[PDB]
Amino acid sequence: AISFDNALGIHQHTVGVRERNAEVISTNIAQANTPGYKARGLDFAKELQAATDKLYRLPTQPDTGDGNTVDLDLERNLFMQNQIRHQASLDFLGSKFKNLTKAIKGE
């Protein structure tokens, strides 16, 4: 054993997925006013499987002739949650190397 895949766990992939998720939410907020755009959601378990997709969000309310299915209340909350979890993933993956370096150097 003793390999980076096992030392880092899955925290090496989660940081990437949280970046992709943040990009999609940023797209949804920007495309909220453009008619005909369908809100895109990212399935977390899919990128989990890709580590070891880009779906559509069904609206809770009807459109108003635009056909745009973006709820700005939902997007802000989902962007806040993703950003908080992204920082935790950096903390988890960052400490993997800090412990790894301390084991090797002994100091």
């Binding site: 809770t60 309310q61 009807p62 108003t64």
Partner: protein, 50 residues
């Protein structure tokens, strides 16, 4: 959820009740007693009721 309902203003019809009659004593003044129309043709030529 069925929460958004638009409303549009439209003309459902017209009021066809008899108008106010003005007695003028002029020979060439005519008013329709009760319901009825006068058929006339406009500038283009298409006939219509007045």
């Amino acid at each position: 959820h069925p929460s958004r309902v638009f409303s549009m203003t439209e003309r459902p019809g017209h009021n066809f009740a008899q108008g106010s009659v003005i007695t003028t004593g002029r020979d060439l003044d005519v008013t329709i007693e009760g319901s009825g129309w006068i058929s006339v043709l406009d500038h283009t030529g298409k006939e219509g009721l007045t």
